[PDB]
Amino acid sequence: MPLEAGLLEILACPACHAPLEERDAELICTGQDCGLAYPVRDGIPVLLVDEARRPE
């Protein structure tokens, strides 16, 4: 009962599975219901919905 992987190189949002767009030091969610923004902290990206930031 192995967990699904499907190439870990595939880009997909944390929960709102959809295309992601990198911008400078922040990541922007792209897709139909996407639009959330995730800033990089200490060189580490944020994949938490609660910490996700809304469009400026």
Interface positions with Zn ion (CB under 5 A):
13, 16, 18, 29, 34
Contact 14, 30 (CB under 8 A): no
Q: How far is the CB of 27 from Zn ion (least distance, A)?
A: 9
Q: How far is the CB of 1 from Zn ion (least distance, A)?
A: 27
What residue ranges in 1-56 does DSSP mark as E strands?
Answer: 20-23, 26-29, 37-41, 44-45
Q: How far is the CB of 33 from Zn ion (least distance, A)?
A: 8
- If the CB atoms of residues 18 and 37 are measured against Zn ion, the closer one turns out to be 18
